[PDB]
């Protein structure tokens, strides 16, 4: 969790997988994925 931790939550990320993300659809946010489901 640690997700109140705004002041030190960049190496979890430091550019360099963002663009993996934003590299989907819509960032893997908006997305759906129907499949077989």
């Not at 931790?5 to 979890?12: D, K, L, P, S, V």
Request: glycine share 0%.
């Amino acid at each position: 969790r640690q997700i109140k931790i705004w002041f030190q939550n960049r190496r979890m990320k430091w550019k360099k997988r963002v663009f993996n993300d934003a590299r989907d659809i819509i960032q893997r946010m908006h997305l759906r994925q129907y499949e077989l489901l």
